[PDB]
């Protein structure tokens, strides 16, 4: 943290953050969500990290070079250490990226190495070549070299993500899935794990072996798993919580902006809220059905009437303000809702649905005040606008993500936030073989468009190709875009260091501080 000249620090440097749900895991290779990544950033540090405004910056690697954007060489700082005092080396990165790639690990983010195009990853994922053939090597203990199969000028932007953080081989090998328990875990970020009580709290304490430890200010941070946005606000206003999770309750938000204006933080956020359709399950394998659902949903009602927190109605997957997005807004978004409603009804009637034999399916969502209220609203809108019946189902966060991966669903609420600021952080999750493809969408035409993006060495050709890929996705109605998020949360006035400038919201507790109050 960089404490401004003249700020008075609190005697007690402790923080309590709400984190939305119980995490899937603390193992960087077994996680895919925001709550998971929030804790991961304090415990495990990769080659690069985001600074306080979100720019990619030195992490374990203090400097790096590239040759033709295909061979990337990272020079690791000599004093990077694990919490047990042992050196972080380039060998730890070799072991870790191979473990991520290994199909036996079954990481939801195995495809992050395909997104960066690390040599031989397709064959490793497919079981055709062993994980030790991955194109990474330690040239010495402090030098990590990555070889890609084609030029990727934004490659280094990928490296702040938890999936490419190091994991300690000896703990993994000795303890298996219990390696992340407090008694067994070893970490290289600013913090160490002190306590982990499922569905109660995760408590982290400063890691004195962290190379940048002298600049760490917060001594202990607690992450809570509260999924009720009402409860989070209540425990924030009672004094227990210093920073809520960034999901705000419909019940209280309008009141909060008039009661504590200065605590309500609302900033740009590169995330998209949508209804994920299971594209491989009948009758959702019929484009008419998907298009009808997409068109009949009234975004103006959801965004400005029922939620009204500053979100923007969405017509694409990739947020339009992503660095490198130059998207074409489809004509259906400019129509009136009435005209969208008639087109929808026409397509469903064309697909075989009648008043006698209507369309009925499930709408799955993760336990939450906000998502339940939006799902009830969407169910009513679809009932009234298109004659469809929906059965709402809630599941806890970890279970909900597993259900989507299993494909044991019809339609699911969903949100995707960028891992790196560039359109393929979204678009690569819809590739036929992506490990992140919970939509179960498989389009050779879409796949081809993205493959072509690294076959040109031109930024305008790439942007035009991203735009065409979004059009192909839209043409197929793979999903139902609802809104682009804003990052709204409450932050006590005494929490310093949270700028709200990072559109990825990659917060590190090592950057915060508590002002005397």
């Amino acid at each position: 943290a960089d404490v401004p000249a003249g700020v008075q620090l609190a005697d007690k440097q402790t923080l309590v953050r709400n984190n939305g749900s119980e995490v899937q895991s603390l193992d960087p290779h077994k996680i895919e969500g925001v709550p998971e990544s929030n804790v991961s950033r304090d415990l495990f540090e990769g080659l690069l990290i985001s600074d306080v405004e979100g720019h990619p910056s030195p992490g374990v690697a203090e400097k790096w070079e590239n040759k033709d954007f295909k061979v990337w060489t990272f020079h690791l700082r000599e004093n990077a250490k694990w919490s047990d005092g042992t050196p972080v080396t380039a060998h730890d990165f070799v072991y870790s990226w191979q473990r991520l790639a290994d199909p036996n690990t079954a990481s939801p983010y195995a495809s992050y190495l395909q997104y960066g195009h690390i040599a031989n990853i397709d064959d490793i994922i497919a079981g055709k070549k062993p994980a030790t053939d991955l194109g990474v090597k330690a040239l010495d203990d402090h030098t990590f070299e990555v070889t890609l199969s084609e030029p990727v000028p934004y490659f280094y932007k990928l490296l702040v993500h938890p999936s490419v953080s190091p994991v300690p081989k000896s703990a993994v090998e000795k303890f298996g899935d219990k390696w992340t328990q407090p008694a067994n875990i070893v970490t290289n970020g600013a913090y160490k794990l002190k306590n982990w009580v499922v569905n109660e709290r995760i408590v982290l304490e400063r890691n004195p072996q962290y190379w940048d430890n002298a600049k760490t200010v917060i001594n202990q941070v607690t992450y809570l798993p509260i999924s009720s946005e009402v409860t989070d606000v209540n425990r924030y206003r009672s004094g227990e919580i210093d920073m809520t999770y960034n999901n705000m309750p419909i019940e209280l938000f309008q009141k909060l902006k008039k009661e504590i204006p200065n605590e309500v933080r609302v900033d740009p956020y590169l995330c998209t809220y949508y209804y994920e359709i299971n594209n491989q399950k009948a009758p959702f394998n019929d484009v008419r059905v998907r298009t009808a659902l997409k068109l009949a949903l009234d975004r103006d009602i959801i965004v400005n009437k029922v939620k009204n927190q500053g979100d923007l109605p969405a017509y694409s997957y990739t947020p339009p303000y992503t660095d490198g997005a130059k998207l074409v807004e489809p004509e259906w978004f400019k129509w009136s809702q009435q005209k969208r409603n008639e087109e929808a009804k026409k397509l469903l009637a064309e697909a075989g649905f009648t008043a006698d034999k209507p369309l009925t399916f499930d709408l799955l969502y993760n336990t939450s005040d906000l998502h339940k209220k939006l799902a009830i609203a969407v169910a009513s809108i679809w009932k009234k606008n298109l004659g469809v019946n929906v059965n709402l189902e809630n599941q806890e966060w970890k279970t909900f993500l597993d259900t989507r991966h299993q494909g044991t669903f019809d339609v699911a609420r969903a949100g995707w936030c960028a891992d790196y600021n560039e359109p393929t952080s979204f678009l690569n999750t819809m590739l036929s073989d992506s490990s992140n493809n919970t939509a179960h969408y498989k389009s050779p035409a879409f796949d081809k468009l993205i493959a072509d993006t690294l076959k040109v060495a031109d930024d305008t050709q790439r942007s035009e190709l991203y735009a065409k890929a979004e059009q192909q996705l839209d043409k197929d109605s793979a999903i139902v875009p609802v809104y682009y998020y804003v990052n709204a949360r409450l932050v006590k006035p005494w929490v310093g260091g949270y700028t709200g400038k990072d559109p990825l919201d990659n917060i590190y507790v090592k950057n915060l501080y508590i002002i005397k109050h």
Side-chain angles (χ1 to χ4, degrees), residues 431-462:
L431 298 172
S432 291
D433 64 337
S434 167
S435 64
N436 295 117
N437 192 337
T438 40
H440 294 267
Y441 174 77
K442 291 191 177 60
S443 165
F446 178 93
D447 284 356
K448 177 50 145 76
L449 291 161
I450 300 315
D452 284 348
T453 69
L454 292 170
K455 274 143 214 73
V456 297
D458 176 332
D459 264 348
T460 313
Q461 298 178 38
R462 294 187 191 101

Side-chain angles (χ1 to χ4, degrees), residues 27 102 105 117 120 128 241 298 333 356 366 420 425 469 485 488 490 492 503:
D27 186 332
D102 189 343
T105 307
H117 305 273
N120 297 320
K128 294 186 192 182
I241 300 180
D298 186 336
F333 187 70
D356 184 35
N366 56 297
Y420 53 99
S425 189
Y485 291 62
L490 308 182
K492 294 289 164 69

Side-chain angles (χ1 to χ4, degrees), residues 443-515:
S443 165
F446 178 93
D447 284 356
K448 177 50 145 76
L449 291 161
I450 300 315
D452 284 348
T453 69
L454 292 170
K455 274 143 214 73
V456 297
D458 176 332
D459 264 348
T460 313
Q461 298 178 38
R462 294 187 191 101
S463 281
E464 291 191 317
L465 285 165
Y466 297 148
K468 287 166 194 42
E470 285 279 342
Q471 287 177 320
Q472 177 65 52
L473 196 73
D474 183 47
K475 186 184 292 138
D476 297 332
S477 296
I479 62 159
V480 185
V482 183
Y483 63 70
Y484 310 113
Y485 291 62
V486 287
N487 186 0
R489 46 153 49 83
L490 308 182
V491 182
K492 294 289 164 69
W494 54 79
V495 177
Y498 182 68
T499 80
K501 280 291 229 141
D502 183 6
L504 307 203
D505 201 40
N506 275 326
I507 299 324
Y508 296 75
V509 172
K510 77 194 185 58
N511 294 331
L512 307 179
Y513 52 94
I514 306 310
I515 297 172

Side-chain angles (χ1 to χ4, degrees), residues 53-54 57 59 94 105 163 181 303 314 337 429 435:
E53 295 181 17
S57 316
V94 166
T105 307
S163 63
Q181 280 311 109
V303 178
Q337 189 54 46
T429 65
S435 64

Side-chain angles (χ1 to χ4, degrees), residues 22 33 41 156 214 219 272 274 348 385 392 457 492:
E22 180 57 30
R41 290 192 294 284
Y156 71 94
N219 291 316
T272 297
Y274 56 111
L348 268 209
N385 289 356
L392 258 58
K492 294 289 164 69

